[PDB]
Amino acid sequence: MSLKPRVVDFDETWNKLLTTIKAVVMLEYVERATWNDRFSDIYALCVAYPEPLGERLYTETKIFLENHVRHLHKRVLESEEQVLVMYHRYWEEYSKGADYMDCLYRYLNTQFIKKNPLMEIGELALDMWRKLMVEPLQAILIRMLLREIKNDRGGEDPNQKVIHGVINSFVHVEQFPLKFYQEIFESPFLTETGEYYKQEASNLLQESNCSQYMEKVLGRLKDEEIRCRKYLHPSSYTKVIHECQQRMVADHLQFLHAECHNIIRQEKNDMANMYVLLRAVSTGLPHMIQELQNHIHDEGLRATSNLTQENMPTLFVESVLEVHGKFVQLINTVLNGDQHFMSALDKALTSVVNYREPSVCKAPELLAKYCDNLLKKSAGMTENEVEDRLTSFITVFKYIDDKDVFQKFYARMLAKRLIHGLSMSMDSEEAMINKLKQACGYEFTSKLHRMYTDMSVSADLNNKFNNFIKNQDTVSFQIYVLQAGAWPLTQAPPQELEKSVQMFELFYSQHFSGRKLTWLHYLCTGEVKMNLKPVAMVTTYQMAVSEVSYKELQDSTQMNEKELTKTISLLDVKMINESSFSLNMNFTPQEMEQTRSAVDEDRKMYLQAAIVRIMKARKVLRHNALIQEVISQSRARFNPSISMIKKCIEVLIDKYIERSQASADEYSYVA
Amino acid sequence: MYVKLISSDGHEFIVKREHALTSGTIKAMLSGPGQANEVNFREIPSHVLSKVCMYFTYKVRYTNSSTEIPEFPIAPEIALELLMAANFLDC
Amino acid sequence: AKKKRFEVKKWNAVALWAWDIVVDNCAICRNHIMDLCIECQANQASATSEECTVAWGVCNHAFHFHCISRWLKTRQVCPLDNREWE
Amino acid sequence: TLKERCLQVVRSLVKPENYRRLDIVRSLYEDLEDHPN
Amino acid sequence: MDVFLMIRRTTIFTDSTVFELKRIVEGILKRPPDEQRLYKDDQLLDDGKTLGECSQTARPQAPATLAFRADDTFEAPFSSPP
Ligand SMILES: [Zn+2]
Ligand SMILES: [Zn+2]
Ligand SMILES: [Zn+2]
């Protein structure tokens, strides 16, 4: 009748309604109109007696659910070991009908949500499916199910649709949704595949060679992931494989680590797979990395050893660069890597470039004569390339332990390279100091920098004197002027000649406030080329007159015979040549020897600066603790001698530092 | 794409399916297996289903829009029946 | 050609510039008068990149400004000559 | 909602003492006494 | 222009000239427009004028208002409870 509340019979709507339920179950054919009638045939029930009555429909529905579940339990039990096939047709003929029944009981629950154990008819029907699975099937089925997965090696393939429906049928029912799936299925499958890959791990390891074992297990894992994606739910993808890689690899890792020593000393794929497998292990990589470090130490040292007595720094630089290129090609090519292996390379070549033969360690000086050698004129090589070769040199410089002596040597390299016009490009030799500066910092390349600026300042200054020359009443040479602290060159200690220095020197007194200049004579030239156009070596040795012998004019003018006797050099080369000396008819180890000390005192100054810098910021330190921090600070300059820092302390306590009593070590600071 | 809604008095009401999917009962009706689309009702009169449909059109069209929301006229004698079928349609 | 003519054409020379002392490195500290002192070479703070602060003294001995300034605070006597420096 | 706002329109023309006697819907007169403002 | 209608014979809910409106009517009814006339309770609606000229006179919760053609030229209420 109308939608007015009518007391309707209890079997009239229940016969056609029940047969409609059974028609919705198994996706049987239901008519397009009776479905349009059932909602009325339920709303009419849930209203007027003159009280609601859905409590009956819920219970009766649950009864039909139970009976159907038990019927399909006897059919499923009838199936001899094919319970999962009729169970697949069961679930795939049960799910859509269950959801359609849940949509069919909308009003049954919209007036029932205000009264809720076990509401949500859909959740209750799936609860009855749970009542189908709690049966000994859950002991049988999984045992019968894993048996179709146990056929893993060469046991393929059953219907991924059927098994995927059986396993996927577990994660569907929930009001912790993965609880039933995890307890019923994930632990037995997990531990059973664990046993499977333990047994087959030992079975494979007894069979194959090392590289063949790694190849095989890699293929096995690559297949295993695809399998887990065919059968299982994604919620276990990370877990299942984590067992596999734990039993096939990392369960025998002593063996792999043992074959590593061999494999990293073969340039030959097996090592790439070695990285791949050891990486997914708790502790797989450290031994391999260690062995690559030792390998590179060996081959590297071997390269940089084959050059003895051959007096070539170029071969040493090119050799170290050769090794570095080799192993960068290696590590980037095969290891997907790296940073660890790269650091091992860096440590190894760090130990290669420092020799301890008895000298010592002969690395920085050679790396100074490589630069000095590569910057000279050599009239030869080609520029637009020298800057490339230096760009390579940046690395071999990077690895040097003592950058200290490299600096102090390159200072004299540059000094002689400038004060005698030996360089090839000012624009380039600046860019070299730019390289060293971007490698170390401002402190390292300062004396080099303004040591390079005094040539520009000296040029402009020479111009200014060229103006001041003729700028008074009445009225030929050019001078370099140097900042006198950035220049390691010494005087190496005769009266004024033709003169002309003072008529020029009054300029430098009036132009600067109080600068005191000192004249160096050790590096002063003259004018060559006798008149007879084409050797002509006459710059120093200002004597200029008989023709007279050497020991017959021992009575020279006011000058000492310290270096005079070593230069009496003009009667040796061309022009004077004791019996008879006739007129012509035509045309550094010891320096370094005593240079080895300025490095020592510069280290004393540097460590002194470290002492003050540290003792001011932090207030007090014990005698041990200040050291290792002086060390921490002066790391990249050089490894400082502990024999020096203590005496440096005992010097600074005479100036900034006080110490009271040594019961517990203690060192305070004084303003 | 288009569904029909028939009242107990005989008046048909054709409208797109999504306009009818507003009430949970009707979206449970078109969810009926068989393919099933046309729908009838043998208990709701026409003077009520017409008001229910006119109620659908508003909140299908005008919701979260930019305008001053007006009120809703309901006749003082069908309001009982409209309330009843409103309880029926779960809307 | 000629044997004894020796006409003296183009000359050259090179020289360093410093301040008006000997000096043996500004005895207050043991660094050069034209190279950074202890507090500045160690402080790693702001300073002029070529001449930090050259301080001439009216007593005709020049030192680094803040060396003889800190020493000037702790005791007014001049170190080299045991007198009052400026 | 049509149901609840029709409830609200009806409660403006029905005494609070006639929420059971109208016999509108037997699963709804239990809701006629549960919807304040 | 943005107007709802109540075209009746059947009452269909759908939503620019009169011709395109007859297309919208032709949507499910599937009949050409030359077989349809439109009347507003006393008048004849022409095709040469747009819908906006022939509005916002019909709210969406209660809008307002089809004479078909049989051969050539077009020819030829809810309940109430007690
Ligand atoms: Zn200073
Ligand atoms: Zn003095
Ligand atoms: Zn000083």
Author numbering:
A (entry chain A): 1 to 116, 135 to 193, 198 to 290, 292 to 381, 383 to 403, 405 to 500, 506 to 523, 530 to 567, ...
B (entry chain C): 17 to 51, 53, 58 to 112
C (entry chain R): 17 to 102
D (entry chain V): 157 to 193
E (entry chain B): 1 to 9, 12 to 17, 22 to 60, 64 to 74, 77 to 87, 92 to 97
Sentences from the paper on this structure:
Cullin RING E3 ubiquitin ligases (CRLs) constitute the major subfamily of E3 ligases that catalyze the transfer of ubiquitin from the E2-conjugating enzyme to the target substrate. The Cullin protein is the core of CRLs, acting as a scaffold that brings together the substrate and the E2-conjugating enzyme. Our work focuses on the CRL2VHL ligase, a complex containing Cul2 as the scaffold protein and the von Hippel-Lindau protein (pVHL) as the substrate receptor. Cul2 recruits pVHL at its N-terminal region through an adaptor subunit constituted by a dimeric complex formed by Elongin B (EloB) and Elongin C (EloC) (Pause et al., 1997), and the RING finger subunit Rbx1 at its C-terminal region (Kamura et al., 1999).
Here, we present the first crystal structure of the CRL2VHL complex to 3.9 Å resolution, revealing for the first time the full-length Cul2 interacting with Rbx1, which provides insights to the mechanism of the E3 ligase activity. In parallel, we prepared the same complex in the presence of an HIF-1α 19-mer peptide (residues 559–577) bound to pVHL, mimicking one of the natural substrates of the CRL2VHL ubiquitin ligase. Calculation of the Matthews coefficient retrieved a solvent percentage of 63.9%, consistent with the presence of one protomer per asymmetric unit (ASU) arranged in a C2221 space group. The full-length Cul2 binding Rbx1 at the C-terminal domain and the VHL-box-EloBC at the N-terminal domain constitute our final model. Nevertheless, for the remaining residues (54–156) that constitute the substrate-binding domain and the 19-mer HIF-1α peptide, no electron density was observed. On the other hand, the lack of substantial electron density for the substrate-binding domain of pVHL suggests that this domain is highly flexible and might be present in more than one orientation in the crystal. In Cul2 the globular domain is considerably moved toward the NTD relative to the other Cullins. In summary, these observations highlight a trapped closed state conformation for non-neddylated full-length Cul2 and support the previously reported flexibility of the Cullin scaffold, which is thought to contribute to an allosteric mechanism of polyubiquitination of substrates. The new structure of Rbx1 in complex with Cul2 unveils a novel orientation of its RING domain, resembling an en route conformation between Rbx1-Cul5 and Rbx1-Cul5∼NEDD8. Firstly, the N-terminal loop of Cul2 assumes a critical role in the interaction, with Leu3 inserting into an hydrophobic pocket on EloC, defined by Met105 and Phe109, and Pro5 being involved in a three-way contact with Val181 in pVHL and Met105 in EloC.
